[PDB]
Amino acid sequence: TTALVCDNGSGLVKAGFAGDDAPRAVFPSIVGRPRHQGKDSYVGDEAQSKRGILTLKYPIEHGIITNWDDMEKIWHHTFYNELRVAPEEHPTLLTEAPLNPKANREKMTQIMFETFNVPAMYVAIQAVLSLYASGRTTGIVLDSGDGVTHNVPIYEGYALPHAIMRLDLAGRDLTDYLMKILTERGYSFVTTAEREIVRDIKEKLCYVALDFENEMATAASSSSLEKSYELPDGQVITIGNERFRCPETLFQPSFIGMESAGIHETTYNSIMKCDIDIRKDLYANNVMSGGTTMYPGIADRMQKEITALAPSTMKIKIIAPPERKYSVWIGGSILASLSTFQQMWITKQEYDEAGPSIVHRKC
Ligand SMILES: Nc1ncnc2c1ncn2[C@@H]1O[C@H](COP(=O)(O)OP(=O)(O)OP(=O)(O)O)[C@@H](O)[C@H]1O
Ligand SMILES: C/C1=C/C(=O)O[C@@H]2C[C@@H](CC[C@H](C)/C=C\C=C\CC1)O[C@@](O)([C@@H]1CSC(=O)N1)C2
Ligand SMILES: [Mg+2]
């Protein structure tokens, strides 16, 4: 009687039942296999734990299920042992990436059915659900996850294909920068195990600089904005610079040898690429979702950043909910449990007559 909502991210899967206030599961989005030709698998955590004897791969690169057979594993694990449920008797909601390919979708679809024999299923735009979980039916989202960040302006519930912005800069690239400028402040973080740390150092300490400059040399001639962080065991390396400098990369891709424009930029471009009737609103309903959109004051930074690039008579709104980190899943949750939605599901039958193409016709 309960359907499922699996939000496939590049870094983390989020899964759960249609109706819970939060994803019952949220595990590493990796898959470990032995070493070679001769227990051929291990998803999420099992894989990390037993890493020492398997080589780990992420099956989703920048929002895209690129490693397929590995994914099937992942799904099987999510169901049968992350939810401990029978796919055959549970309708399934799958998150999807903006501009995700017809194929990459028809595949996903195919799978659920042919492989898992789910009863009915559906694929939804991440930013969209995410948006729906904030009230708005129309607006423009900023989804900066782990492997990518997008920009989606949506109209009365419809993402504006033409006007979408894909920025391959996200959490990891971001951690990587951190664990770079941290080996250069006199350390050595290079192995992946240091990453997960420099990463936790990230999630935790570092933040959003309002005025990059006055907040650069603000603590550049002071310790007042410094902090301590105990190493994996004992040490207390201090942070100062690396803090707002890490995220800052989101507003300044240069820092990574990235030619692309920063957030507020792409956000603007996007409104601007949207027929004028709506922008007024777009400016007004600017939603933030995604782990990396979790830094502090990034909220404000954007307020500023934007207004600066927009009509000095635009009512500009920033909406950065606390639940961001799972925004999507929830949206999926709600949308999934909706009566009327019950007609949106794509039953096997439907799928049996017409093919996997049946999915594209949405909402
Ligand atoms: N407070 C925080 N500040 C900065 N980054 C954070 C914070 N909390 C979590 N993150 C980062 O957000 C990322 C996880 O975000 P999220 O779950 O939205 O990504 P995903 O959905 O798995 O991947 P995708 O990019 O495909 O959407 C990690 O890179 C993590 O370090
Ligand atoms: C608490 C946690 C949060 C998170 O966001 O995890 C995601 C998923 C994680 C999986 C790979 C690692 C080795 C194995 C197990 C991890 C378990 C929990 C990780 O790889 C990330 O860390 C990468 C690496 S560094 C970064 O910025 N993204 C993001
Ligand atoms: Mg995601």
Side-chain angles (χ1 to χ4, degrees), residues 2-35 38 40-41 43-45 47-68 70-72 74-83 85-88 90-101 103-155 157-181 185-193 195-213 215-217 219-225 228-229 232 234-241 244 246-279 281-303 305-316 318-324 326-341 343-347 349-363:
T2 56
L4 301 173
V5 170
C6 178
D7 175 7
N8 321 263
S10 310
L12 293 166
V13 184
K14 306 85 185 315
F17 307 85
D20 328 320
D21 72 347
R24 211 151 214 165
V26 58
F27 59 91
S29 188
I30 70 236
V31 157
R33 300 208 120 169
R35 297 257 160 135
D40 317 305
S41 308
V43 177
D45 297 297
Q48 181 53 174
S49 178
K50 304 181 208 95
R51 79 217 192 206
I53 70 167
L54 317 162
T55 46
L56 302 173
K57 316 166 111 183
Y58 283 94
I60 280 145
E61 285 182 50
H62 296 110
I64 323 285
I65 286 176
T66 70
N67 183 304
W68 286 111
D70 276 28
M71 200 61 205
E72 305 199 59
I74 306 222
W75 283 330
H76 191 96
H77 168 283
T78 323
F79 298 140
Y80 294 135
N81 91 346
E82 269 297 15
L83 303 184
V85 301
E88 330 87 43
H90 281 121
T92 312
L93 197 59
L94 287 188
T95 46
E96 179 201 79
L99 319 177
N100 179 93
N104 198 265
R105 181 167 26 227
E106 269 181 50
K107 175 119 274 185
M108 312 199 186
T109 298
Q110 210 105 48
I111 299 172
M112 305 306 287
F113 283 132
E114 318 249 297
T115 290
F116 299 103
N117 291 230
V118 290
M121 123 276 183
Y122 178 101
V123 205
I125 289 283
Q126 292 170 50
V128 175
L129 296 170
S130 212
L131 176 53
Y132 285 20
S134 69
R136 298 76 178 160
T137 157
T138 293
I140 190 191
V141 178
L142 180 56
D143 188 328
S144 186
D146 180 54
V148 42
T149 90
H150 280 76
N151 269 297
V152 195
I154 323 180
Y155 198 25
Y158 290 58
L160 295 161
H162 66 297
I164 292 168
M165 296 305 142
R166 154 168 161 296
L167 169 43
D168 273 56
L169 156 53
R172 288 196 230 170
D173 311 71
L174 197 58
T175 293
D176 286 6
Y177 185 57
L178 196 40
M179 79 182 228
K180 164 207 195 67
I181 42 157
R185 183 145 181 243
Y187 308 78
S188 186
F189 294 82
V190 179
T191 47
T192 53
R195 176 138 107 163
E196 300 290 305
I197 318 299
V198 69
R199 201 211 73 213
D200 186 78
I201 305 174
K202 182 192 84 181
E203 303 193 356
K204 285 258 203 167
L205 290 163
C206 51
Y207 70 137
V208 179
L210 196 46
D211 186 347
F212 187 47
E213 294 322 309
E215 161 58 58
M216 176 65 227
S221 77
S222 293
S223 314
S224 37
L225 288 112
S228 33
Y229 188 63
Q235 314 132 89
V236 312
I237 168 195
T238 190
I239 193 183
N241 173 168
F244 53 82
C246 178
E248 181 64 35
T249 324
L250 289 184
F251 292 75
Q252 295 184 56
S254 68
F255 292 13
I256 307 308
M258 292 222 80
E259 320 196 355
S260 296
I263 293 177
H264 49 308
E265 276 258 298
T266 56
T267 316
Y268 184 74
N269 290 44
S270 212
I271 287 81
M272 283 307 166
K273 195 155 207 179
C274 281
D275 210 293
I276 165 157
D277 291 284
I278 57 182
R279 312 184 180 167
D281 294 302
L282 291 194
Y283 280 98
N285 290 295
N286 213 72
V287 203
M288 303 233 269
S289 67
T292 50
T293 77
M294 270 290 184
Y295 296 87
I298 170 193
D300 307 284
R301 178 53 178 285
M302 274 286 269
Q303 171 77 68
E305 257 335 310
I306 302 296
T307 44
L309 323 161
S312 52
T313 51
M314 262 335 277
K315 213 277 176 244
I316 303 166
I318 37 298
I319 321 175
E323 70 211 83
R324 273 173 271 168
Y326 298 129
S327 195
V328 189
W329 192 80
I330 304 188
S333 192
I334 308 188
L335 183 143
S337 50
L338 294 195
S339 51
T340 171
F341 171 63
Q343 315 312 303
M344 267 31 264
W345 287 110
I346 296 183
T347 82
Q349 200 214 315
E350 311 189 305
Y351 179 91
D352 280 326
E353 319 153 316
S357 33
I358 167 67
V359 200
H360 307 98
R361 284 251 146 187
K362 286 188 180 175
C363 299

